[PDB]
Amino acid sequence: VSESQLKKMVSKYKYRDLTVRETVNVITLYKDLKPVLDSYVFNDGSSRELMNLTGTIPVPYRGNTYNIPICLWLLDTYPYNPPICFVKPTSSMTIKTGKHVDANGKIYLPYLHEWKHPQSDLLGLIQVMIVVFGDEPPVFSRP
Incomplete structure (x- = not known):
């Protein structure tokens, strides 16, 4: 969440300062999104540790x-x-x-x-x- 911890998470990214700059902004603007480092499984079959911004966004x-x-x-x-x-x-x-x-x-x-x-x-x-999503909510939770 600090720029410095973000910069370590993305340490193998090609364009790190660009990635970190936008990330800091998203998570400051959207307090319910958090940066996690996790394995993403491609169609090619292989895995990759990538940064994911995950949590919720507010939709009227x-x-x-x-x-x-x-x-x-x-x-x-x-x-x-x-x-x-x-x-x-x-x-x-x-x-x-x-x-x-x-x-x-x-x-x-x-x-x-x-x-x-x-x-x-x-x-x-x-x-x-x-x-x-405010026009068409993509998750339902009630009748």
């Missing part, structure tokens, strides 16, 4: 605010490749599938599709997600 829907649980995986080429993003329901939630969310909870957005540094960043991504 029909006049109330919901804490929607997400995961934002940063590739070691961050910021030049978009993060890989998931909704993360708890055992007492369901994923609600749609245009922007598949049954594994993976997120699909023009913002991700059009990602280009430096015009695209995590702050702008999160805001897009808030607009999309």
Whole structure:
């Protein structure tokens, strides 16, 4: 959470200061997102220790605010490749599938599709997600 501890976590990232700068900003703006270092399993079959920003973001829907649980995986080429993003329901939630969310909870957005540094960043991504999810919540928890 301190810049210095963040900089150690991302010690094998290609663009470290760029990764850390945006990370510090996301976690200051979104106090319920936290940087964790965890193994990400690719389709190629192999694993990688990568930094994940994980926790919840606040989403207004029909006049109330919901804490929607997400995961934002940063590739070691961050910021030049978009993060890989998931909704993360708890055992007492369901994923609600749609245009922007598949049954594994993976997120699909023009913002991700059009990602280009430096015009695209995590702050702008999160805001897009808030607009999309406030219009169509990707997790359900009640009838």
